[PDB]
């Protein structure tokens, strides 16, 4: 799980 613009995605 990585975070982009304060949101976590996979």
């Amino acid at each position, epitope marked *: *799980l990585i975070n982009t613009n304060g*949101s*976590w995605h996979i």
Partner: antibody
Amino acid sequence: EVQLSESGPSLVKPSQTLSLTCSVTGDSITSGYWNWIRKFPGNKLEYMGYISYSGSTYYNPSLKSRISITRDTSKNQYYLQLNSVTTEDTATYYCARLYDGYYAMDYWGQGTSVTVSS
Amino acid sequence: VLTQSPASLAVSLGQRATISCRASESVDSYGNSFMHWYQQKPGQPPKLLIYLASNLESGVPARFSGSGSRTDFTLTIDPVEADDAATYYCQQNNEDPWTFGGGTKLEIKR
């Protein structure tokens, strides 16, 4: 012993630029997320932003106009810059590490007081 | 937005303490709750107590406990000790913006 040490001026004149440095010893900023947080004198906490293991960044929206976070992995430091400060920006500033398994801020520095005044 | 309740609170040695964190919107995603708890005393940085809603940080006594739903969370100290006098903050990083709760100051009643 992951450990973080902030540094920078104690006193800044309004409309100048705030420049703080977090020096990290005890693991590498090659990995993990590296954040900036400030605590106002009323004792409220406010998240400011981070720079990640890959160099991407994320900033609080109430700051986007004037905040910049960068890093120097060979020194193992990363840096805050906040342009055009006012008295509202008087706070205790902390840097802190966040990591992948935990997704929470687990190592803090002691904090550095910064006053914006003429 | 995160609202804590109460803003102050008093507890005798050995009783149960319950601090509440209210969320404006669901902070769940990918099976975890992105909700954490921090203790802070004057002159010191915040200290992580509970990460991911219910997981105890190592180094922290088992007297501290965390438990929470998508938008309602709670922190529990049982039994409270003299050392537990501090201010407790909840923080959310599910989605933009990352924000802290207003804070809850715990007083030990003697």
